[PDB]
Every structure is written in C-alpha cells, then in structure tokens.
Scaffold this active site. Structure first.
Site, PDB file in Angstrom:
ATOM      1  N   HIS D  96       0.799  -1.081  -0.142  1.00  0.00           N
ATOM      2  CA  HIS D  96      -0.083  -0.019   0.017  1.00  0.00           C
ATOM      3  C   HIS D  96       0.922   1.241  -0.074  1.00  0.00           C
ATOM      4  O   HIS D  96       0.659   2.088   0.897  1.00  0.00           O
ATOM      5  CB  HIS D  96      -0.897   0.151   1.120  1.00  0.00           C
ATOM      6  CG  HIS D  96      -1.842  -1.361   1.382  1.00  0.00           C
ATOM      7  ND1 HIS D  96      -2.784  -1.644   0.397  1.00  0.00           N
ATOM      8  CD2 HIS D  96      -1.638  -2.436   2.102  1.00  0.00           C
ATOM      9  CE1 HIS D  96      -3.270  -2.797   0.876  1.00  0.00           C
ATOM     10  NE2 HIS D  96      -2.428  -3.237   1.805  1.00  0.00           N
ATOM     11  N   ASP D 270     -10.506   0.440   4.787  1.00  0.00           N
ATOM     12  CA  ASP D 270      -9.378   0.211   3.971  1.00  0.00           C
ATOM     13  C   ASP D 270      -8.913   1.151   2.875  1.00  0.00           C
ATOM     14  O   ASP D 270      -7.895   1.233   2.611  1.00  0.00           O
ATOM     15  CB  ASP D 270      -8.895  -1.294   3.786  1.00  0.00           C
ATOM     16  CG  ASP D 270      -9.324  -2.008   2.661  1.00  0.00           C
ATOM     17  OD1 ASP D 270     -10.550  -1.298   2.144  1.00  0.00           O
ATOM     18  OD2 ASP D 270      -9.046  -2.770   2.046  1.00  0.00           O
TER      19      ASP D 270
HETATM   20  N1  NAI Z   1     -11.042  -4.136   6.292  1.00  0.00           N
HETATM   21  C1  NAI Z   1     -10.626  -5.211   5.874  1.00  0.00           C
HETATM   22  O1  NAI Z   1      -9.951  -5.783   6.633  1.00  0.00           O
HETATM   23  C2  NAI Z   1     -10.598  -5.704   4.357  1.00  0.00           C
HETATM   24  C3  NAI Z   1     -11.304  -4.745   3.447  1.00  0.00           C
HETATM   25  N2  NAI Z   1     -11.295  -5.213   2.197  1.00  0.00           N
HETATM   26  C4  NAI Z   1     -11.981  -4.307   1.218  1.00  0.00           C
HETATM   27  O2  NAI Z   1     -13.219  -4.622   0.931  1.00  0.00           O
HETATM   28  C5  NAI Z   1     -13.757  -4.070  -0.174  1.00  0.00           C
HETATM   29  C6  NAI Z   1     -14.526  -4.822  -1.249  1.00  0.00           C
HETATM   30  O3  NAI Z   1     -13.679  -5.730  -1.595  1.00  0.00           O
HETATM   31  P1  NAI Z   1     -14.004  -7.038  -2.357  1.00  0.00           P
HETATM   32  O4  NAI Z   1     -15.301  -7.552  -2.429  1.00  0.00           O
HETATM   33  O5  NAI Z   1     -12.959  -7.993  -2.802  1.00  0.00           O
HETATM   34  O6  NAI Z   1     -14.337  -6.008  -4.048  1.00  0.00           O
HETATM   35  P2  NAI Z   1     -14.872  -6.559  -5.295  1.00  0.00           P
HETATM   36  O7  NAI Z   1     -14.275  -5.928  -6.608  1.00  0.00           O
HETATM   37  O8  NAI Z   1     -14.985  -8.078  -5.389  1.00  0.00           O
HETATM   38  O9  NAI Z   1     -16.503  -6.409  -5.165  1.00  0.00           O
HETATM   39  C7  NAI Z   1     -16.938  -5.009  -4.860  1.00  0.00           C
HETATM   40  C8  NAI Z   1     -18.325  -4.906  -5.260  1.00  0.00           C
HETATM   41  O10 NAI Z   1     -18.733  -3.321  -4.907  1.00  0.00           O
HETATM   42  C9  NAI Z   1     -19.693  -3.211  -5.946  1.00  0.00           C
HETATM   43  N3  NAI Z   1     -19.925  -1.620  -6.045  1.00  0.00           N
HETATM   44  C10 NAI Z   1     -19.484  -0.675  -6.529  1.00  0.00           C
HETATM   45  N4  NAI Z   1     -20.070   0.578  -6.290  1.00  0.00           N
HETATM   46  C11 NAI Z   1     -21.234   0.406  -5.911  1.00  0.00           C
HETATM   47  C12 NAI Z   1     -22.414   1.095  -5.288  1.00  0.00           C
HETATM   48  N5  NAI Z   1     -22.661   2.275  -5.553  1.00  0.00           N
HETATM   49  N6  NAI Z   1     -23.655   0.326  -4.810  1.00  0.00           N
HETATM   50  C13 NAI Z   1     -23.525  -1.045  -4.528  1.00  0.00           C
HETATM   51  N7  NAI Z   1     -22.315  -1.829  -5.158  1.00  0.00           N
HETATM   52  C14 NAI Z   1     -21.079  -1.160  -5.787  1.00  0.00           C
HETATM   53  C15 NAI Z   1     -19.168  -3.570  -7.134  1.00  0.00           C
HETATM   54  O11 NAI Z   1     -19.999  -3.623  -8.231  1.00  0.00           O
HETATM   55  C16 NAI Z   1     -18.239  -4.681  -6.795  1.00  0.00           C
HETATM   56  O12 NAI Z   1     -19.429  -5.860  -7.226  1.00  0.00           O
HETATM   57  C17 NAI Z   1     -12.266  -3.280  -0.742  1.00  0.00           C
HETATM   58  O13 NAI Z   1     -12.028  -2.115  -0.098  1.00  0.00           O
HETATM   59  C18 NAI Z   1     -11.453  -4.051  -0.109  1.00  0.00           C
HETATM   60  O14 NAI Z   1      -9.924  -3.639   0.149  1.00  0.00           O
HETATM   61  C19 NAI Z   1     -10.814  -6.417   1.947  1.00  0.00           C
HETATM   62  C20 NAI Z   1     -10.212  -7.278   2.864  1.00  0.00           C
HETATM   63  C21 NAI Z   1     -10.029  -7.059   4.117  1.00  0.00           C
END
Ligand code: NAI
Ligand code: NAI
Ligand code: NAI
Ligand code: NAI
Ligand code: MG
EC number: 1.4.1.1
Lengths: 373, 373, 370, 370
Positions: D96, D270
């Site tokens: 990052h 994050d």
């Molecule tokens: N807090 C933590 O420890 C962790 C956080 N994360 C975070 O989780 C987040 C999501 O990750 P993933 O699910 O792997 O991403 P991903 O790309 O698999 O899915 C994200 C989804 O959000 C949707 N989306 C985008 N804009 C939207 C809106 N306005 N309304 C509804 N849906 C919308 C997208 O279409 C996509 O389907 C990322 O920021 C990732 O870095 C991931 C691992 C750990």
C-alpha cells in the site's frame, strides 16, 4: 449372571453382538461376560480389546452357549447351531421366525426363552432395534442396485444419475419406512429419479416434505405398483408387517413385463421376501436371474459394513441387554412393554401371534407367562 | 466420403462411436456409413437399427478400416489393431498418447492422420469431448469406491453415509475439474464426508458455493495431500494436465501409512495414473493390492454404462464428425481451432507438443500441416 | 382484572414480560394493563408503543405492584422488591426457587401466590415456557463461540466457516435437544463442521434427516465424546437431564488435551454446567481460562438479545396469561394441568416438591390448594 | 535460493507469510527456507511444525533479512524495519505504497526489488492475492455484526436468526463482490433476512441463482439504498470502485433515520470507508457511536483469525512464491504478466504509475526494467 457372545456363523457375517464398552458396562454391573475367541475380529475388535473391557475369552462356541444365561447374537441360529439351544437360557437376537419353520421348531423343541430384536416395539409402534439395521440395509440397497445396473454385471447398463442431457435411472422403492426412506435418500443422492410407494399416506407426506417433492410419492395399489415397476430400472422391495411374512407384491408375471437388465433388490427377504421370485441369497452368490431381470436377496445385508453396523446395532440394543442381565427376562419384560413385544419362545411356547398364524403353529398368549401370582 | 465405425475391442467395451441419429445425418449429407456387424449391440443398437438409419453393415473389422476415409472409434487402437491403421485415413477417437509410446509409434509408423477426442479444446480451455466421459467416470468412481469399501470386497467395511450416531466414510478427491466434481457430488449424495483438493482455487470456490461448504475444499500441496490421504477411507484420483502424462501425487510410501482396507480409484489411469502404484486394470479384474489398500485402475470406466455413455459421447462428438466428413481433416481444422487442437499425428509427424515432451519424441508444429500454399 | 408489568431491575436484564400485542389482547378482553414507564425500552418498545396498544403507563414500580391483580415479570423478585410481594396478587415469572432460599422465603413470608414459568409442563413432559429461551440460547452459543474463537479474544483464531481451500472450525455440540439443535443449526449455517452427540438416538436420527447428514451425529459414548472434544475448536454444552443437575461430561483432564485457544460454551451453566471446570461468568467478564482453553458460561444468555427474547417468551406465556387474567389462578390451574405444574407458593405454602426437598422446607401438595 | 520469513511486527498482526505446506514445497524444490523463531505462533504454527517441514529457524529478525534472497511478509515494512531493506533482495508483501511516502521512500532509498500482493492482477482484472482476504473479511463481518447487535455490546438486541414466531435481523449488504457475497452468505446462514445491493446486475443474478432467491437482491441506487438502510438492523459496507477511494454511500443524515442500536460494519474502511461516518477503529475499541447507531470499522479484519487468514493468503501466494524462487524476479515477471503488475520498486525506481501520480514521484515503466 453370565452373558455370552459367540462368533456369528452365517455366510459372510462380520458383525458381533457387543462392543468393549458394553462388556465394560456389564462387568461394572457385576456380570460375567464370556466371548468366543475371534468373535469381534470382523468388526475390528480384538480379543485383547474385549479382555481389557472385562470379558473372559473362551475357545469354543459350545462353551459360550453352555455357560451363558443370556446369549446375545446378531443373526438367527442356523442349522449347525440348533444343538446348542438350551432350556433356561435367554436368546436375544434377530430371529425372523415367520420366515423359518425350521428355526422356530428348533427354538420350541429346545425349550429356550428367545426374544427377537425385530419385534421389540415401543408404544408409538416403532421398532428401535430393527431401525439401525434397516437404515444400513436401505443405504446399501441403493449402492448395490447401482452396481448391479452396470452392464459388466449383466445389468441394463444405465448410470444411476445419468449425465447432463441423458436420462438417469428410474428407481422404484416399495415401502416408505426406515429401509425405504434410506434407500430412496441414497438413490436420490446418486442422481436417480426415485418413486416411493406406500399404503401409509403419512409416510409419503414425510418424504414429500423432506425432499420438497424431489422424491416422488405414489399411493401403493396393485394398479399403481404394476405401472411403476414396468418403468423401473431398479426396484427396491422394502415393506414390512412387523413380525410377519412379507406380502408378495411383485409377481413373476409382472417381472416378465420389465425392461431387460432391470435389477430388483428385496430387502424384505429376511421376512420371506416381497417379490414372488425371491429366495435367500448370500454375499458369496448374491444374484440370480428371473426372466430378463436380476434379483438380489441377501438376508444379512449389514454384515458387509460391520465397522458401521456393529456399533449402530449395539448403540440401540445395549439398554435392553443391561435390563435383561440385571433383572432376568420375566421382570425386564414386565417392566418394559416394548421388550415384552419381542417375546418369541419360552419353554416350548410360540408367543408371537403373527408368527403362529404365518406358520400354522399353535399360539400361546405372552400375557400368560408374564401374569402375576 | 466413407465413414467407418468398427466394433470396439477393449475389454468390456460396450460403447459405439455413433448412433442411428448420427448415421442418418451423415447419410442425409451424402456420405456412406460403414458399420461392423454387431458394433452397437453393447449399447442396445441393433444392426437393423443402424441399417434403417442408412448404414451399410459389414462382416469384418478388416473391411471397415480398409474402406473408411474417416474412422470413428471410442477408445485407442490396441495391438491387434495396429496393423489395421492406414495412411490417408482420418482416425477420430480417445487416444491418450502420452500414456502409450507403443500406440504413438503405431500411429506414426502407419502414417495415419489422427485427432484425439480428449485434446479437442475450446478457446476458454475446456475439453468438450472429454467432458461427458469425465462426468460418467466421476459418478462411477463414487459408486465403485462405495462398493469396494464393503468388507465382502476386501474393503474396510465402512458404509459411505454411515447411519445416525455412526461416522460416515471419509472420501478424498484429488482434482476439482469435471471428473472430481462429479465424484465429489455423488459421494456426498451417498452421505460421505468429502474433501476435494486442487491447485486451482477458483474450482475450489465453485465447489464451496455449490454445496454450501458441505463438500470440503483444501488447497492441494504435498503436505495437505498427505494428511488428507492418511485419513481417507476412499481416495479418488482425478487430476489432468491436458494431453500430458498424469503427475504422480500419491506415492507408495504414503499408501503404506493409509488405513487397512482403504480404496483408491485412479480415474487418471487413462493418462498413466496419478498414484505411483497404479497400472491399468480391466472390468474383469479391476482391483489389486498395494500395501494394505485396494487400487482400482480401469482406463475405460464409462464402458459399464453404455446406455448412458454412448449417447453422452455422441451428443458431443457428432458436430465435429459432421465437419470432418463434409470438409476433410485439413479444411475442418483450419476452420475450427478447437478441432485443430486435437490433431495428434499426420504422415509420421507428431503434432502434440505435450505428448512429444512426455515421450521424448520430435515435435512438429500443427500449424505447419495446416499452412496455406 | 388489572395486569401489571414492572421494569426488570436485575443487572443486565433488559427484557420485559409483555409486548404491545399481548397488551392489545388483554385490553380487548376487558382487562386493564398497567406498565411501568420505561419498562419496554431495553427491548425497543417505547411507552408510546405500549400506550397505543391500550396500556396505562405508570410512573413508579410501587404503583404497578400495588394495583396489579396479576403481576408478570421475566426474572425472580430480588431483595429490593421483596417488600412489594403481596397476598392476593398472582406473580408469574421465572423463579428458580431451588437456587435461592432468600427468594423462596420472601415469597412465603409475603403470602403471595406465585407460578414459575420454568415448571409449566405439558403432558408430553415439555416445558413450553423454557423452550423459547433454549432456542435463543442455542442460537447465541454459536454466534458467541464464533466471536471468542477470534485471536483478538484469546481464542485459537479460527473463522467458523473457513474460506475455500481452508479448514472450517470443528464444532462439537453435546446434547441434541432444543438448545443443542439450535446451536448446531446456526454453527452449520456459519459454515463450521458440526458434530452433535446425544444418548437419545431418535434425536440424532432427526438431525440426520433434517440436514441430510450435513450435521454429523455421534452416539454419546465416552470414546466418541472424548474423540470429538479433542478435535474441536468450539465445544457447546447443551445437556439437560430431567430433574437433575447437569452431569459433568467434559473433565478438566480432557480439556488439558484440547487444541490451545479452543472455546467451550456451557449453556447448561444454569444447572451447574456440564463441564467439570464451568463456573458462572458475566457479560463484563464472560470468559476465563481452563488449561489452554477458553470457557464461556453466562447464565442469562437470552437477556443479551432482549428485542428477540422478549417476544419469544411472551408469545409463549400469552395463552397462560390470558387464562389467568380471564379466570383467576385457581380456575385456570384447575382447567390446565400444565399451568398447575408451575404452582410455586400460595399463602405461606410451598407447592413444589423438588424445591421443598432441595431447600429443606415443608412441602404442601398443590391438590390441597386447588 | 534462500527464502526468508520474519515475524510480523505491526501491533495486533499475528499472521505469517508461509505455512509448513509452503515450506515443504520450497524445500522439496531445493530452496532454503529461513524463519524467525516464533513467527507462526500467532497462527498456531509452532517452530517445530516449520522445522519438520524443512525450515531453518533463526533467532533474530536481522539474520532473516540479511540472508534471504526472497523475503516474504504479510504487512508493509514499518519504520523499525527500514534499516533491514536491501539492494538485491526481493520483497513480496502487502505494501500500500500510495498510503505511505515513508515506506515508499525507504524502499526506493534501499534499492530493493519489491512486489505488492495487492496489485498482482490477472487479465480479467481480478486481484487473486486480495481475494482470500476479502473472503475472510466478509465472513467475519457477519459474525462481528451479529455479536455487536447484542444489547450488551450496545446494539439493538436482535438475534440474527430470530426464533420460531419471532422476526430475524434485517441485514443489508452493500456490494455483491467477494467480501459482500461472503458476508451475505454467512449472515443468511445465521438465519437473517439478507438484502444485497449492487450496480452489477450480473452479480445479483449469481446471488439469486445460488441461494434460490433466499438472499434478496436490489439494484443499487441512492433511493433503494436509503430505503433498505432505514429498515436494517445490520448494514455491511463492502463496496470497491477499481482505481478509486470508497464512495460515501451512507450519509450521516441517513444514519440519523435508522433504528436505534443498528450496527454498521464498514469493510471498505481500508479505502477509507463507504459510510460518511467511518473512521479507523481498533480491536481494543472496535465500535463507536454515530447518532443512535454503532459503527465497526477495522482496517485489518483478517488479522483476527490468523490460523484461517495465514492459510487463505499463503495458499494464494504460493504459486507466485514458487516462480520467484525457481526463476528470480526478472524471468518470473516476464513470464507472468499478473505477477509483473505487482512490481513496485527496483533499484530506486518506482514502478507503479498510480503510486507515482499520487505521491508526485517520477514514474519508471515496469517494461523498462524487464
Ligand atoms: N477491512 C478489511 O480488513 C478488508 C477490507 N477489504 C476491502 O473490501 C472492499 C471490497 O472488496 P471486494 O469485495 O474484494 O471487492 P470486489 O471488487 O470483489 O467487489 C466490490 C463490489 O462493490 C460493488 N459496488 C461498487 N459501487 C457500488 C455501489 N454504488 N452500490 C453497490 N455496490 C457497488 C461492485 O460492483 C463490486 O461488485 C475493498 O475496499 C477491499 O479492500 C478487503 C479485505 C479486508
Ligand atoms: N436384508 C437385510 O439384511 C435386512 C432387512 N430388513 C428388512 O426390511 C424390511 C423393512 O424394514 P423397515 O423399513 O424397518 O420397516 P418399516 O415398518 O419401517 O416400513 C415398512 C413399510 O412398508 C409399508 N407396507 C406394508 N405393506 C405394504 C403394501 N402392501 N404396500 C405398500 N407398502 C406397504 C408399511 O406401511 C411401512 O411404512 C423388513 O423386512 C426388515 O426386516 C431390515 C434390515 C436388514
Ligand atoms: N478412466 C476413465 O475411464 C476415464 C478417465 N478420465 C480422465 O480423468 C482425468 C481428469 O479429467 P477431467 O476431470 O475432465 O479433467 P479437468 O481438467 O476438468 O480437471 C483436472 C483437474 O486436476 C487439477 N490438477 C492438475 N494438476 C494438479 C496437481 N498437481 N494437484 C492437484 N490438482 C491438479 C486441475 O487444476 C483440474 O482442475 C483425465 O485424465 C481424464 O482423461 C476421463 C473419463 C474416463
Ligand atoms: N445459559 C442460559 O442462559 C440458558 C440455558 N438453558 C439450559 O440449557 C440446557 C439444555 O436445555 P434444552 O436444550 O432445552 O434441554 P432438552 O431437554 O431440550 O435437551 C437436552 C438434551 O441433552 C441430552 N443429553 C442428556 N445426557 C446426555 C449425554 N451424556 N450426552 C449427550 N447428550 C445428553 C438429552 O438426551 C436431551 O436431548 C438446560 O439446562 C437449560 O436450562 C436454557 C436457556 C438459557
Ligand atoms: Mg518453473
């Protein structure tokens, strides 16, 4: 008392009527446990295992039968065993007397007190000692029927579940009780199209709920059974009238109208078989031809999976064994109505009314030998 | 052209490489179809059936091979057929060349043009002609593994699904592709506890979604494979590197640490076997011992269910058969890159790079036989 | 008659003994319902919600207790409420009198008529008012076991369901009754590999059919129990033996053999715990170490989800509350033997034989007051 | 080559960048694996387990960093580790760099070759090394949301699944991607009524197909989202817009209209939260109030379950690690464009355009180093 457990002697009978845990519990209660050397080996229980539990290991079958007040077995005494049956001994095992005049005659002529696992029956009507064996036999029926459906086994050459674009096997199960339910469940789990028939519509309702209609149910009439069996690749006969000879539901005439290479598994062979053409077979030679079909009629099905079935059985029987050991047959049967329904013979008397009618032998009331004084 | 379908000659091979529907469609297109008398009888397709569809029935295998421009088979040519291979004929069938230098040499020395069903590959990487056979073999592996776990078969004596209160069989599937997925699915339907391993985590994700984590998934490394295999009652080997010799993932040393009477089914035997101790077996004598386990290594599994498998195969192959008949091998392969990927030999040249690498034999680029002038 | 519902006063008790739906039904039948202001707030029921349903909202606990003919509570009266207990009033609540001589004596000295929710028992032997609380506690055990398995809580650091290619948590439930069934179901829904143990094979058979073998079942022999516990990341103790303290099925010696950071949740802490090492824990300090293991033993689990628990309980108590309100305690107990089985005190007499022998107090036969 | 795995030194970071399975595969191929004594303890991997698989265990972090050709980690090097970074060593870890000029500059000054797990990216655009962490985070979201819904944690006091006759929790998942799908799946397995929102209608169809309509799906618009959030007991924020910070989809104004005691879990914290009110929270203090609502915002959720997380991550990184060890960084990156997308620094050159743009540093095209 002394409770004795001989080695099973039926063809390919790998089960045993007690585990070390049951032996240790009988020993803790003050009883003497005598086990024929090697009795537990088919189920992977060593003589050393039984010994550590509190059992005394004896060399011969003769000595176990001679010294035991309570004799626990898995299957019914066969011909070479009739000479070991004693007056004043309690025999506790699967008996299937309605299916065997020769077994019945031997028990009666010996004067023994026998109680059948398969007729122990609770007030709700369930058969708790038969249940675990029917669960095993039903699950096995699905896998053996699938195996014999292979063209390499003389079968039709149809895969249980088909594959995308190609029809699965058509499976018909007659009887929606423990065995039929378990056969249906496994056949369905293999991808087959399963129809279950019964005259008890509430058992059909149970199947309909559990599998959300995926297992088809049909009210069992001669008219309905005939049409379903003609369409079947595999028929599993799983009916029971408790303690009685199975009704002949699948006629040889009907079998003549079946698809060539169809397989029929008669789980109900232990009670005489529900197919007209059924006769007892063994794990050595399990199948024979009727018309263009293959019949499978093994009367000790759970013997092939003894690591499963030995424990399944003794999990269920031990509570009844313990009461028989502690109090004797008369008091135990008086205290437990369900156990009393298992009463089969005593001092030359046939105590089963259904077995009496089925064999054409005089019937003695169980309430007479249990009457108070 | 003339398209010829001989009777299959492998041990217990009841399948046939075409159906009356396929025969009728080639005939409609102006092709002559030659079929050896009796070729479809294993799949319940009579000579009369094939003739009504427009086929010429011929008495000998020798005539089919000699006269056919395009020869359709199910399995690879065996030694008694090596002398029947010809220059100027197109042979279209399952080949498995990486697992037989003998078959490879025979095809090369004959100068024949061969196309392997199992290396016809679409741009997404799928093998559309292998797939239905993998589906059949995977479903069979579960039912055949269950059967050999019976104590009467020399197995451990464990029922696949157990029964309430008693542990089910522990099944390990190596490979989460078509065969592995299908083996897992059926084993799970029989009530077993199933763990699937793969190096492809997206295939593990697919299984996790489909059965809601009921089918366990583990990333495949040697370390996880070892632990998994030592705990297993049944191991099903279902890995593939397309066109290549299968990797040896289960050593004889690991097998020595397995439970007595465990069963291992190598589906990948057709590519040489993914267990070190695997060698090809037949439906006549399918099993042999390694240490205290049973190996099952049949390289033509779908042959036992020809009513399912003949139709499943031909449903997939026929589109390609038609293009080869209508246009010949070079024009058909030029127009269809998926078909071209199945190219195996032509005029003594070996056109598969994986086979050439695995046999240590010179490779010639498929593009060079397809190049325009 | 007048039915009174005061605010619960025991620590961390956020439930209330009636909902707007029960208030509306009582009121439709001609009864006055008196509720202490704020009584429903722990359960997300506002005073407006209760008033809209027909309740009279009352400023003080004293007034509710003084004017109620039938007094509904969740927990037993505690020391500061003993002076509110009243002859000629019916108290209907969870009592657990065998656990408090102080409470029993207070009820007896007050001359009040009391009926315990936990001993209302139908002919088949079921306890219909404990049942919903066992459901809630079972479901909570899975969620709280999952949480405590996180390494940040001192647990092994295992996610209930794993992720593809990675081993899920191994969860063992001891007891296949109401709480254990519910514990097994949620833990399985979270993706854990669940094994249930029972001595009752019929209950294992039911689990097997319902989840088609997804939830594993083992007969509760010593060998199977010890084997399962040794493999477990999370153990849930959900055993009850009718009329008895919980048997100690998991010994400290067995616990010494568990995986470090493994979690043990003893639902049966209310009958002493079914693990040797169990003792009462608190929402403030819910876990303690035994060997390399974390025990969780909170005796009032359903209080933590008062919005859910208040409804589960009061849906169950409702038909009994309506009969008591309409008919009075004596006629209602005469007409419903299940209700009569809850009879606890009347005019200085102790009406439960089990409580009487457990405490060493004279027993008066319920038939004598009916 | 020599592959080195030091102990993680960030507070509450208890994952490790290799498992015994990984060590065995590297060692079977003839690589030397060096592991700091104690590195796997947080993940329940003992020094004995690592040694048995073929690792050499070394007393100090300094030795691991000095002797390793390929240095594997979970988190970015922190200040105390800047002095350990080396020219001629490959670092492979979550970096990052956009978020830290200090880390970026230390990597550049050192001359080290570094590859970020989070920017390894296959042709379909997927991030295969982020994927397992999103799976873990989403499943964890459902369990921690369930826990914080308990009234004893200050939540509304609602059980996820309800109990028969009683309303389940209403759970809203924003995003149907990896984390969102997994959150929805676990929350649904706990018995909650789950609604998932996404702008990608194909992800909604997948959810509809897989759970037979049991998981509800709604097209994501401000309007639909406002309605769903107002009815929710639990909101899980799981949005990702590729190449951008998380949009603020849930306003503080919207939060004002929610049920008292509602819980909001911002997985997207994050990137730095999809709720307006989100700010980083800690395992010591994981929640805070916005209006009458509870926010949970932990930026490193997978560190909670190290036994699960370590294996999820290292199963994903293993094939990349084996390529790097077998073939060196240059040949491995040339042969694998996905691996090459992770290239971050080499000999003082910054190889990410996004990081170079964000920090105002010169950009060096990765193709020029390959
Ligand atoms: N807090 C933590 O420890 C962790 C956080 N994360 C975070 O989780 C987040 C999501 O990750 P993933 O699910 O792997 O991403 P991903 O790309 O698999 O899915 C994200 C989804 O959000 C949707 N989306 C985008 N804009 C939207 C809106 N306005 N309304 C509804 N849906 C919308 C997208 O279409 C996509 O389907 C990322 O920021 C990732 O870095 C991931 C691992 C750990
Ligand atoms: N071969 C072997 O090794 C074993 C055989 N069995 C046998 O399997 C048979 C079935 O046992 P369970 O399923 O436990 O019995 P069950 O009593 O649970 O079920 C039998 C069912 O058959 C139905 N039935 C009776 N007459 C019928 C008719 N004329 N038409 C349609 N349905 C009819 C009944 O309504 C009942 O639902 C018994 O003979 C049992 O001894 C059981 C264990 C092992
Ligand atoms: N014996 C018989 O009669 C038949 C055998 N087969 C054979 O079954 C085998 C598998 O076929 P399909 O399932 O269609 O292949 P597939 O390509 O669909 O799946 C093979 C799977 O193995 C995995 N794999 C490869 N190397 C691995 C490793 N080192 N460790 C772990 N996993 C690994 C791949 O990632 C892939 O998912 C082939 O050899 C095929 O020819 C197919 C039909 C019949
Ligand atoms: N901690 C809390 O806040 C709450 C605790 N509970 C308690 O949880 C306990 C369980 O309650 P229910 O599930 O309603 O009881 P239940 O009567 O519905 O089931 C208990 C089960 O334990 C089984 N059992 C008995 N001996 C066993 C052994 N040796 N091994 C395995 N299983 C055995 C019985 O066969 C029975 O199926 C009770 O003590 C109940 O009071 C209930 C509500 C809340
Ligand atoms: Mg390489």
């Amino acid at each position: 008392m002394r409770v004795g457990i001989p080695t099973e002697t039926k063809n390919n009978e790998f089960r045993v009527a007690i585990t070390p845990a049951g032996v240790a519990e009988l020993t803790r209660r003050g009883h003497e446990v005598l086990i024929q050397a090697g009795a537990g080996e088919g189920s992977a229980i060593t003589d050393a295992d039984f010994k550590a539990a509190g059992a005394q290991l004896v060399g011969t079958a003769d000595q176990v039968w001679a010294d035991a007040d309570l004799l626990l077995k898995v299957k019914e005494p066969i011909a070479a065993e009739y000479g070991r049956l004693r007056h004043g001994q309690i025999l506790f095992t699967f008996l299937h007397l309605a299916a065997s005049r020769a077994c019945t005659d031997a028990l009666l002529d010996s004067g023994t007190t026998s109680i059948a696992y398969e007729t122990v029956q609770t007030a709700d009507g369930a058969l708790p000692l038969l249940a675990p064996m029917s669960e095993v036999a039903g699950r096995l029926a699905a896998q053996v029927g699938a195996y014999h459906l292979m063209r390499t086994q003389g079968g039709r050459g149809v895969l249980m579940g088909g594959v995308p674009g190609v029809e699965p096997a058509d499976v018909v199960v007659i009887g929606a009780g423990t065995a039929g339910y378990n056969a249906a469940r496994i056949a369905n789990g293999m991808g087959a199209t399963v129809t279950v028939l019964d005259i008890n519509i509430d058992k059909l309702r149970q199947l309909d709920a559990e599998f959300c209609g995926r297992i088809h149910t049909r009210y069992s009439s001669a008219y309905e059974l005939e049409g379903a069996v003609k369409r079947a690749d595999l028929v599993i006969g799983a009916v029971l009238v408790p303690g009685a000879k199975a009704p002949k539901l699948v006629s040889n005439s009907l079998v003549a109208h079946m698809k060539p290479g169809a397989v029929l598994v008669d789980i109900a062979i232990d009670q005489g078989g529900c197919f007209e053409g059924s006769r007892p077979t063994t794990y050595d030679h399990p199948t024979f031809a009727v018309h263009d079909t293959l019949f499978y009629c093994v009367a000790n099905m759970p013997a092939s999976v003894p690591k499963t079935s030995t424990y399944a059985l003794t999990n269920a029987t031990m509570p009844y064994v313990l009461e028989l050991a502690d109090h004797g047959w008369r008091a135990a049967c008086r205290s437990n109505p369900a156990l009393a329904k298992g009463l089969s013979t005593h001092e030359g008397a046939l105590l089963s009314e259904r077995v009496a009618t089925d064999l054409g032998v005089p019937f003695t009331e169980p309430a007479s030998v249990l009457a108070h004084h």
